[PDB]
Amino acid sequence: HHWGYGKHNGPEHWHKDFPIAKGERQSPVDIDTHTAKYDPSLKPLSVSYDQATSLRILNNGHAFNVEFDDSQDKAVLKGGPLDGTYRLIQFHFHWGSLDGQGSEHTVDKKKYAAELHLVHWNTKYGDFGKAVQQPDGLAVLGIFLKVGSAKPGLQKVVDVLDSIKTKGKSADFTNFDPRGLLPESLDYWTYPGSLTTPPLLECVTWIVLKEPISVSSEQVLKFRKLNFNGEGEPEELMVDNWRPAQPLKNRQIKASFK
Numbered sequence: 001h002h003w004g005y006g007k008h009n010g011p012e013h014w015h016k017d018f019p020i021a022k023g024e025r026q027s028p029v030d031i032d033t034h035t036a037k038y039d040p041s042l043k044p045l046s047v048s049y050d051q052a053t054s055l056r057i058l059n060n061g062h063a064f065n066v067e068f069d070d071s072q073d074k075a076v077l078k079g080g081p082l083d084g085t086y087r088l089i090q091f092h093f094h095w096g097s098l099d100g101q102g103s104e105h106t107v108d109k110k111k112y113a114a115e116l117h118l119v120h121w122n123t124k125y126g127d128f129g130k131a132v133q134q135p136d137g138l139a140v141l142g143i144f145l146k147v148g149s150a151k152p153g154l155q156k157v158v159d160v161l162d163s164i165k166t167k168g169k170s171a172d173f174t175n176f177d178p179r180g181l182l183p184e185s186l187d188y189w190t191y192p193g194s195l196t197t198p199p200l201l202e203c204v205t206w207i208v209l210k211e212p213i214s215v216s217s218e219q220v221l222k223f224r225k226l227n228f229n230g231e232g233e234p235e236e237l238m239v240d241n242w243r244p245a246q247p248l249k250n251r252q253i254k255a256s257f258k
């Protein structure tokens with residue numbers, strides 16, 4: 001009886017195996033745009049993905065991960081609210097059964113159709129498993145998806161999903177350039193938070209971009225053909241794999257922009 005996103009094992013149940021679910025710095029949160037304060041001391045983000053080395057795509061039963069070679073400083077996030085160098089390890093998405101829901105973060109209680117998470121770990125901790133034990137271990141770059149025009153840089157991901165329909169399937173996925181998933185503006189909000197799935201560790205500096213990317217209805221419909229189940233199990237579509245907004249508690253969301 002493992003955690004997931006159903007009635008019997010969804011987000012309102014996670015606290016029984018992961019008591020940190022009710023902690024002081026949980027994610028995601030609603031971003032109240034009027035309460036977020038401009039912080040003129042924040043730096044522009046530095047997103048250096050020119051040497052990124054993608055390797056593989058995996059259906060893990062909760063989402064799909066595009067995994068990178070993080071054994072060297074090849075794709076790094078720096079600047080903004082961050083001290084030091086954070087290395088890209090993987091990206092994944094969260095999405096809905098309908099275009100009106102799917103994002104984890106919300107903006108003035110608005111839900112987007114999906115949310116991209118580019119996951120990075122602080123190189124001062126040596127690898128990912130050590131970094132998730134530290135309050136500044138991870139930096140996750142969050143990017144909203146709205147349905148409209150296609151995102152051409154997403155289509156190579158969409159077209160491999162048929163080969164990883166079910167939990168535990170993986171496929172070669174080399175030479176994918178994550179720069180094709182970024183919006184024009186790197187304006188962001190930032191706050192201290194957590195992983196949004198178990199183990200819900202409070203190890204993340206969240207950096208959420210204000211500008212969403214547009215994807216087509218056909219692109220998101222292909223996300224919704226994935227399965228949570230393994231091969232030869234009753235089909236359960238991989239939809240609504242998002243955690244809802246958690247209490248902000250004693251936190252301030254900072255804006256990089258006016």
Ligand SMILES: NS(=O)(=O)c1ccc(CCN/C([SeH])=N/c2ccc(I)cc2)cc1
Binds near residue numbers: 130195197199
């Ligand atoms: N949705 S999210 O962006 O907040 C998000 C949610 C979950 C995760 C993955 C955590 N899995 C862990 Se804790 N894996 C390892 C543990 C030990 C070792 I050694 C290596 C890996 C990342 C990002």
Ligand SMILES: [Zn+2]
Binds near residue numbers: 092093094117196
């Ligand atoms: Zn995520």
